[PDB]
């Protein structure tokens, strides 16, 4: 499940091709890894890193977590942004798109340790 999770992670969260993103990239996006399935998912972040330039991260220096644990890392990766535009209802979901290099922190579990969780 540490896996499991990982794919989760992977599928929420990384998408390495994608250069930035406009409004229509996180509609798109957030529909095709299944996060409007339901309902819409508030606010969403894509980071655009090659999977194993981010599994890297799990090998900088250990910090604390929101939640006390000390297992999340940080780094500097190109993002997207998604947030829902509130003019949207469900399922046809509708988003905002925000690209930025930006800091970001990530849980790391397992044996190598994969990222398993975003914690910002």
Not at 32 to 41: I, L, N
Not at 43 to 63: P, V
Not at 84 to 96: I, K, Q
Request: net charge positive; with cysteine; proline share 3%.
């Amino acid at each position: 499940m540490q896996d499991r999770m990982y794919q989760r992670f992977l599928r929420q969260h990384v998408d390495p091709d994608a250069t930035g993103g406009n409004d229509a990239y996180c509609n798109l996006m957030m529909q095709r890894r299944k996060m409007t399935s339901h309902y819409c998912k508030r606010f969403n972040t894509f980071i655009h890193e090659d999977i194993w330039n981010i599994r890297s991260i799990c090998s900088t220096s250990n910090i604390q977590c929101k939640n006390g644990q000390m297992n999340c890392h940080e780094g500097v990766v190109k993002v997207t942004a998604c947030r829902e535009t509130g003019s949207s209802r469900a399922p046809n979901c509708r988003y905002r798109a925000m690209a930025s290099t930006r800091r970001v922190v990530i849980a790391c579990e397992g044996n190598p340790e994969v990222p398993v969780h975003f914690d910002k």
